[PDB]
A paper describes a structure:
PRSS3/Mesotrypsin is one of three tryptic digestive enzymes produced and secreted from the human pancreas. Additionally, mesotrypsin displays differential activity from the other two human trypsin isoforms, displaying reduced capability for activating pancreatic zymogens, reduced activation of protease activated receptors (PARs), and elevated proteolytic activity towards proteinaceous trypsin inhibitors. Mesotrypsin differs from other human trypsin family members at twenty-eight residues; Arg-193 is one of the most critical because it is located within the active site, at a position where almost all other trypsin and chymotrypsin family serine protease members possess a highly conserved glycine residue.
Upon obtaining pentamidine, we assayed the three bis-benzamidine compounds against mesotrypsin over multiple substrate and compound concentrations to determine the inhibition mode: competitive, non-competitive, or mixed inhibition. All three compounds exhibited a competitive inhibition mode of binding toward mesotrypsin (shown for diminazene in Fig 3), with inhibition constants (Ki) of 3.66, 5.10, and 10.57 μM for diminazene, pentamidine, and hydroxystilbamidine respectively. Diminazene bound to mesotrypsin most tightly while also being the least selective for the other trypsin isoforms, and was in turn selected as the best candidate compound for further investigation based on this profile. We set out to crystallize diminazene with mesotrypsin to gain a structural view of this candidate compound bound within the mesotrypsin active site. Following refinement, well defined density was observed for the first benzamidine moiety of diminazene, which was observed to bind within the specificity pocket of mesotrypsin. In the present structure, nitrogen atoms NAA and NAC of diminazene display hydrogen bonding contacts with Asp-189 of the specificity pocket. The positioning of diminazene in the specificity pocket closely recapitulates the position predicted for the ligand by the docking screen, with a ligand RMSD of 0.614 Å. The second benzamidine moiety of the diminazene molecule exhibited diffuse density, which may be attributable to exposure to the solvent channel, permitting multiple ligand conformations. Although our high resolution crystal structure revealed the second benzamidine ring of diminazene to be poorly ordered within the mesotrypsin active site, the top ranking binding pose of this molecule from the virtual screen presented a conformational isomer with diminazene interaction at Arg-193.
Author numbering: 16 to 34, 37 to 67, 69 to 125, 127 to 130, 132 to 184, 184A, 185 to 188, 188A, ...
Amino acid sequence: IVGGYTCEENSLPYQVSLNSGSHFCGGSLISEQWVVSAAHCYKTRIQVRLGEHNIKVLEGNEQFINAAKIIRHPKYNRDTLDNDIMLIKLSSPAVINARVSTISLPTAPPAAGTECLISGWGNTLSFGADYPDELKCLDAPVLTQAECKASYPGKITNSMFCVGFLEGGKDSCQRDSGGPVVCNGQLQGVVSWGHGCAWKNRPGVYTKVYNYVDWIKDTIAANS
Ligand SMILES: [Ca+2]
């Protein structure tokens, strides 16, 4: 997250870190045993880290649980990032408590102009890279589809929407990928891509979670 602030500790209890030696992506806990992330974050083995604030120091609220199933959307396109979403089934359920808990799936799409909360342990620089120890947060609005499309002409599919600031300065970034965009208490987006981070006319592009609620339901039911 570029241009954000350090979140209050364990104030986003649905935020997870995907770890494969180091942190590499975010995710969102949607039930005791299931996480939503980006398909481009797939690896064959993933450890999910819940209850984190400082990802470098064991503070006492962490739960580390291996992924048992890692299921990309079957229409994920690895060139265009169309359908950039995946589900992770934990090998055992997380213990739900004040510091680890779920985020609701969305009941409607978010309107343009809605203020959302984006979070993660991704890069904090617009040129180069620096990764933080503590979870970062960003308050940002949903942009119109026309703004999204004008920012990335020919690249915005029907699974994508934009959130951010066309003037630049504040955005998600590398290793925020897979993590949440929450608007009015519902998971509306998955951090997906952009050109650079926090550049003018290059807002973040996010997967439209609302478009996948039925897919999530069905996939979970079939893998239970
Ligand atoms: Ca920690």
